[PDB]
Design a protein around this nucleic acid. Structure first.
Length: 116
RNA sequence: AUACUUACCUUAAGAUAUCAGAGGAAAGUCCUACUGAUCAAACAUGCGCUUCCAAUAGUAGAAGGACGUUAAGCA
């Protein structure tokens, strides 16, 4: 796939023009034949088109080892202090304090291979 | 702490209520647990003296602030 994208980039640049290119672009997909081969060079499942129940969040620092992290539900660290002074700050809401010591591991190598 | 060593200094004067009257050491000085009058201070003590001292029968209000927010307010 890396070969097909590199050779098609060299082929497209050498053999086509700006008219055909700007007609090839529609922003509903954000496909463009010069930049999209570069972005998807090594990502096979690349597509361009609540983020704490995702498994990217849950194993962020450590890959393979998934843990629910305690976090403050209403967190004010985006807010600047000049606007925080305007009205009184709510108490924190929380999430997942119970799970700071439980961490789970999907041990496929022990189960599928040693235990067969 | 003692002691020893050095280094730096070792000074503006004067006064303690006023005025008047009697006495003592002709002008003035000094003094009187002397005597009047005024003044000032302290301490007691009074004036039919003058001003001021916050809801609970209610969820307030008065005085003074903010080097507080709205706020890149509006012109």
């Amino acid at each position: 796939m890396n070969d097909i994208l590199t050779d098609y980039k060299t082929f497209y640049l050498t053999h086509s023009n700006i008219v055909t290119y700007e007609s090839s672009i529609i922003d509903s997909n954000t496909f463009d034949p010069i930049l999209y081969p570069e972005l998807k060079m090594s990502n096979p499942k690349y597509d361009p088109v609540d983020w704490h129940k995702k498994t990217e969040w849950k194993e962020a620092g450590h890959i393979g080892i998934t843990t629910e992290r305690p976090q403050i539900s209403n967190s004010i660290i985006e807010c600047n202090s000049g606007t925080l002074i305007q009205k009184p700050i709510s108490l924190p809401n929380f999430r997942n304090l119970e799970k700071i010591n439980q961490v789970k591991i999907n041990d496929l190598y022990t189960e599928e291979f040693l235990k067969e």
